[PDB]
Amino acid sequence: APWFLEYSKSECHFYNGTQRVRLLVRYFYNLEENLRFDSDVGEFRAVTELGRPDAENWNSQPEFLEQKRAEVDTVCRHNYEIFDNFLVPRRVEPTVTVYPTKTQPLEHHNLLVCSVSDFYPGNIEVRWFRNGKEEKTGIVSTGLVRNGDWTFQTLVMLETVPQSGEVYTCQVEHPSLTDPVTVEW
Amino acid sequence: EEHTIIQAEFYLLPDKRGEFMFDFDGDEIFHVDIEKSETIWRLEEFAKFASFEAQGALANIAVDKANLDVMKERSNNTPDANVAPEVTVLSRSPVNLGEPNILICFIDKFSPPVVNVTWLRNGRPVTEGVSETVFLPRDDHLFRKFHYLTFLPSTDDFYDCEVDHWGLEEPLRKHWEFEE
Amino acid sequence: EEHTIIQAEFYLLPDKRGEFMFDFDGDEIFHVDIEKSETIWRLEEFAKFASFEAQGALANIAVDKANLDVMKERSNNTPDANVAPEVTVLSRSPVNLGEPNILICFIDKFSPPVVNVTWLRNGRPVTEGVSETVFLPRDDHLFRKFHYLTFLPSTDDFYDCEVDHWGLEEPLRKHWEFEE
């Protein structure tokens, strides 16, 4: 079945606040990106043949090209200042829970799971400790799962053969936490 | 500070569907209901901190409507293949029997941006207690999309996420069951 | 102070023509060249005191393109009659033999906004040394439009302004000759 798609992404990239801003407009037609507009370039740049006409036509409109370059201020900067009020500063504490599993054969247990869910933003640290010593190998992660509803979740597992007398402790550090959370097992 | 603000829009055909939306660090801030000509915040809370005039976006789409006609002739036999989606289903939060939870059906890397998703409980079509996001953008030229379903954890029930796409031979079907 | 600032735009069919322009106290400040996607000042001088982003206007027209399709079905057999234009021809400034002057062909109160005007010198089609304004708005729902022709005053030559419109049975033809 034949489908035809005109799509456009207008990316605003922010480095250290509004300090460094950079627009990035990218046009596609179906699966092919055929044109783009780099703020630090100043004008349209075809990316494929099908994107030439527009670059030539749109580039010959100094009034228009005046506007685009403006957008880094008009839109990017503009909107950043608005979002800066609740988006940039948004924080949701993660719910930390631990528990064992088999994952393989069985009898005893060899997979210790630290489940960290419902948190924001995405940057976070989850460390595993055996009797006070950090486990740097034998870690398995599910990665940073984005739920699309502005909250993440993840699992950080430790491969281990539990020796009675040993206390395992998951450590979780996150911007929404004053002090790193811990959970022992 | 390291942040990204993406404004994505598009128009499709034959489907005759358009979209306009804003993304902040990989999450939807809101989109515009073409039909209803209104702004839809991805989270209620967002409305009290901002505002947007939807006719603006509608304009842009009209733009894109026309642009696409141009693009179709400009290419001459440009259409071709599409990208089937990868689907993954999993619980939103730790699953505890009896405690209401949410199943997330995550549709990734595909285009055109149009799908037919269906939630299946014990092989049955669930249409109540479900939600979905518009098509979200990726680092590339493909889209991503979330589907949700509220449910009551049980050891005896099973769930399926059925996704249909042009790039699919036959409907795709991702399964999911509770495990203690 | 008593002033008026009018912004007029429209899209026509079948003709498939659109317009966008600004008026200040009955005079054109400028309009937007749909085709060339550029701003045309009615007087050179105006550019140095202002600026306008033409893609904006183009947007609006796209809007109006769509709107018209809606309006056509919404009415169902709405079309009907039109308004023939009143034409008047006269000199721009006192006429003195030998001294270059300008003939103005003033087309008034008509719609749809589309005409076929032709300058005639001794029955001959003049296409050099002529100019015209877009369609201007009136206090009502009809349009006005100017046509110009540069000429060399002579006691033996005669001029005609030939206007054609849908509301006309046959081409209209206004005459003009010098008189001392």
Binding site: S8, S10 | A50, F52, A59, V63, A66, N67 | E53
Partner: peptide, 13 residues
Amino acid sequence: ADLIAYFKAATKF
């Protein structure tokens, strides 16, 4: 709660 500005698309002739 100021307005969220967008990007005026363009017409592809």
